[PDB]
Design a binder for this molecule. Structure first.
Ligand code: NAG
Lengths: 34, 49
């Protein structure tokens, strides 16, 4: 069907400091949590 | 398949199971117990629920 849209090997990128989510639904202010 | 017969022993009889799973210490709750709701007071040492 719609196979082979184009031909190219995948590239790679540096994610940096990305992908961090909120671990829990508890409000915390001015603190360091591990 | 299960051969649930009325003549079968207690070991081989149908048994209905409901498992209730709930999670505490989480987001705002929706399902709650049948408890009343007293008015809200401020600047006064009081018990709260
Ligand atoms: C290509 O055509 C149909 C059209 O409905 C599409 O849904 C389907 O993915 C494809 N069919 C194949 C690859 O056999």
């Amino acid at each position: 069907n719609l196979t082979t849209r184009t031909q190219l090997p995948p590239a790679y990128t540096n994610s940096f400091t990305r992908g961090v989510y909120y671990p829990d639904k508890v409000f915390r202010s001015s603190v360091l949590h591990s | 398949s299960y051969g649930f017969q009325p003549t079968n022993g207690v070991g081989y009889q149908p048994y209905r199971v409901v498992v209730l799973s709930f999670e505490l210490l989480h987001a705002p709750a929706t399902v709650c117990g049948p408890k009343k709701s007293t008015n809200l007071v401020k600047n006064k040492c009081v018990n709260f629920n």
